[PDB]
RNA sequence: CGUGGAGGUCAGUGACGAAGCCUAGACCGUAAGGUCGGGUCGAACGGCCUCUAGUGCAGAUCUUGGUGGUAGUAGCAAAUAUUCAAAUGAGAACUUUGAAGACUGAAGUGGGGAAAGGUUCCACGUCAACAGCAGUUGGACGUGGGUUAGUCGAUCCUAAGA
RNA sequence: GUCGAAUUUGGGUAUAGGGGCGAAAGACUAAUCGAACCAUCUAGUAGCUGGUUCCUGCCGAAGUUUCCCUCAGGAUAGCAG
RNA sequence: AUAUUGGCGAGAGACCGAUAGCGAACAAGUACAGUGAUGGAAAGAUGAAAAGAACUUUGAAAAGAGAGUGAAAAAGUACGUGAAAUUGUUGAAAGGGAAGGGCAUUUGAUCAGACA
């Protein structure tokens, strides 16, 4: 949702967001290699 | 950071907090609930009137053996009080939140208290000496207070073949 | 100087929450007072009024 | 250690004292005073059947 | 595998010896390998690091940066190089604490005792 | 069925995330339990064949630590008593000065000492904690200053005694 | 109640636990006296009270007999494997 | 040739892993208590590196909000992880002198498998 773009308790930490970015880069590298 | 709840679209919101504040947790919870959901200027004027004893904070949960007053009839209660220390701490946090919203550039006439939350800080543990050479606890119950003010802004149906035939027949019978 | 002052003010917090008079207040309460937990008063002399 | 949990001066406060009859550390002026001792269920007490 | 009965393989003893080693022992513990050029020139592999020798960083984020040793902070098991710093907006410069095992000596500060140490380790200077 | 550690093996799992913990999600066992997904987390951990034991808790007025309801409740009512203005300060029922009203009433709420305490004396700075309200004040916190003997005492004498 | 003496009191000194001291109350002897306090032997002694930690399957009792004089505490016999 | 819970120097363990292991992993026989003999605790963990949050703004200040450092502040000298009791807010629900439980289904919400 933040990539595409009231009161909530759902938040994304920067630690988890960086980990998601790194893992997505891993997956994209795999997709390009296949 | 790490509020109890955040606002989506933080660009239209401001927040404030105060931790380990030596003020009664029960009174402060009552004050925060009395303020919850209001517009900011109305809340500030109401707290000023509470300090002047023209209006009252209704006491809904932490209210056993409280006195009764006619000023609780505005909120459909008989038990209300005027906790000055709690009102002053909440006034300070409201002023800070308004200042943060002004620094962000938000319209100050559309701000409302979208979130407010009081929970218990670690206790201040004094002790007293009592009869027969006893030591009894004598403790303050401090508060953590947080708030967020927000700019207020103004189907596939699965049918069986029998149902489909019934609808088609109705369509043929009608225009 | 301000750095050391902030370090001292941060270190003060636990004792201030325990409401000590200062570094010098080191009173220790016993876990159980025997004169408070050894009461068995027969028909006769008692230990308190 | 064969002395572990035994280096304590403790005694039971007796029956009818509204507390459990486990032996308790005497003296005063410290948090150790009045705490249970010598038991395998006690913090700081001797273990059950110490290894030899 | 150790063979002497005078040496201990106990991890607790080794760690206590490392963290309570005195300054003269820490001098030996803070050793740096020579560069390939200096290794060929002098015939030795590693030397204890001292204040006025030039080094090349071969590990970490500061890899490739060159400079002169600014201090041997033996109390914190580190060395400080003059050109390797962390900078702030207010003008503050904090030296980076580097370990000599992650450095390479490119130019030795040579004195009489340094020459004697190289020769007694088996050097061939000049 | 489960737990700590030990021999062997799976050239086992793991920074593309080990262990732990949370979970409106999924499955296998009659069950003890086991397995999987998501979140959090950040460096170790397991299956199987065997060895070994400080190996499984709801209770013991159990032990240690932590936390509720009671509850913003009981209460903060002995010692007659406080009030006005200015100043200081962010803030004054409680600080300072002035203006008043009272009280101790010389067997004192006065002025000194002995025992004991040990710097509490005084100045400057100063408020986080403490002063069961408050606090700009303090016997509090920080930094310093201060106790001058031939004549006052000890020191000398002896008492009961040691 | 007593208040000029069998008065009140400071300091010094003496008496120490199976001991002292007592105008005698088993009073007092540091909130401790039908036996001070402290440490150790010592995890002292149990006729008694309380508690005693995972699952499932199968089997599954006992108050009925003789005796140590009888209480108490033991033996045997019976029942279940 | 034998003994050795003291002293000095060493090497080890199918031992314990911060309520454990010595009372003491830490300025521990310390703090504190007691006239005295004696009694006797609690208390370990930011980060690789203090880089420990400059600067702006609100506030008397503590602090807050931006910003910044750092891989991470879901690491801010209350600091690895961060359970339970107990608490706050939000959302859903129930409630005519307790609640909880078993069998069965309705209603609302939510969800897995199987789909050539
Ligand atoms: Mg009342
Ligand atoms: Mg008293
Ligand atoms: Mg132990
Ligand atoms: Mg994991
Ligand atoms: Mg056990
Ligand atoms: Mg339990
Ligand atoms: Mg049970
Ligand atoms: Mg209990
Ligand atoms: Mg009241
Ligand atoms: Mg009065
Ligand atoms: Mg008069
Ligand atoms: Mg005087
Ligand atoms: Mg003074
Ligand atoms: Mg007060
Ligand atoms: Mg002072
Ligand atoms: Mg008379
Ligand atoms: Mg310990
Ligand atoms: Mg943490
Ligand atoms: Mg909970
Ligand atoms: Mg009713």
From Swiss-Prot, chain B:
The modification Phosphothreonine is found at residue 69. There is a cross-link at residue 45 (Glycyl lysine isopeptide (Lys-Gly) (interchain with G-Cter in ubiquitin)). The keyword Cytoplasm applies. InterPro entries: Ribosomal_uL22, Ribosomal_uL22_CS, Ribosomal_uL22_euk/arc, Ribosomal_uL22_sf. GO terms for cellular component: cytoplasm; cytosol; cytosolic large ribosomal subunit; preribosome, large subunit precursor. PROSITE patterns: RIBOSOMAL_L22. The keyword Transferase does not apply. Component of the ribosome, a large ribonucleoprotein complex responsible for the synthesis of proteins in the cell. The small ribosomal subunit (SSU) binds messenger RNAs (mRNAs) and translates the encoded message by selecting cognate aminoacyl-transfer RNA (tRNA) molecules. The large subunit (LSU) contains the ribosomal catalytic site termed the peptidyl transferase center (PTC), which catalyzes the formation of peptide bonds, thereby polymerizing the amino acids delivered by tRNAs into a polypeptide chain. This is Large ribosomal subunit protein uL22A. The gene is RPL17A.
From Swiss-Prot, chain C:
Residues 1-49 are annotated as: Disordered. Residues 1-28 have a biased composition (Basic and acidic residues). Disulfide bonds: none annotated. It is found in: Nucleus, Nucleolus. Belongs to the TRAFAC class OBG-HflX-like GTPase superfamily. OBG GTPase family. NOG subfamily. Involved in the biogenesis of the 60S ribosomal subunit. Present with 28000 molecules/cell in log phase SD medium. Associated with nucleolar and cytoplasmic pre-60S particles. Directly interacts with RLP24. This is Nucleolar GTP-binding protein 1. It comes from Saccharomyces cerevisiae (strain ATCC 204508 / S288c).
Swiss-Prot record, chain D:
N-terminally acetylated by acetyltransferase NatA. It comes from the Eukaryota. Component of the large ribosomal subunit (LSU). Mature yeast ribosomes consist of a small (40S) and a large (60S) subunit. The 40S small subunit contains 1 molecule of ribosomal RNA (18S rRNA) and 33 different proteins (encoded by 57 genes). The large 60S subunit contains 3 rRNA molecules (25S, 5.8S and 5S rRNA) and 46 different proteins (encoded by 81 genes). uL4 is associated with the polypeptide exit tunnel. uL4 interacts with its chaperone ACL4 and the nuclear import receptor KAP104. There are 2 genes for uL4 in yeast. Belongs to the universal ribosomal protein uL4 family. Component of the ribosome, a large ribonucleoprotein complex responsible for the synthesis of proteins in the cell. The small ribosomal subunit (SSU) binds messenger RNAs (mRNAs) and translates the encoded message by selecting cognate aminoacyl-transfer RNA (tRNA) molecules. The large subunit (LSU) contains the ribosomal catalytic site termed the peptidyl transferase center (PTC), which catalyzes the formation of peptide bonds, thereby polymerizing the amino acids delivered by tRNAs into a polypeptide chain. This is Large ribosomal subunit protein uL4A. The chain holds residues 53 to 104 of 362 of the full protein.
Swiss-Prot record, chain E:
Keywords: Cytoplasm, Ribonucleoprotein, Ribosomal protein. GO terms for biological process: cytoplasmic translation; ribosomal large subunit biogenesis. It comes from the Eukaryota. GO terms for cellular component: cytosol; cytosolic large ribosomal subunit. It is found in: Cytoplasm. GO terms for molecular function: RNA binding; structural constituent of ribosome. There are 2 genes for uL24 in yeast. Belongs to the universal ribosomal protein uL24 family. This is Large ribosomal subunit protein uL24A. It comes from Saccharomyces cerevisiae (strain ATCC 204508 / S288c). The gene is RPL26A.
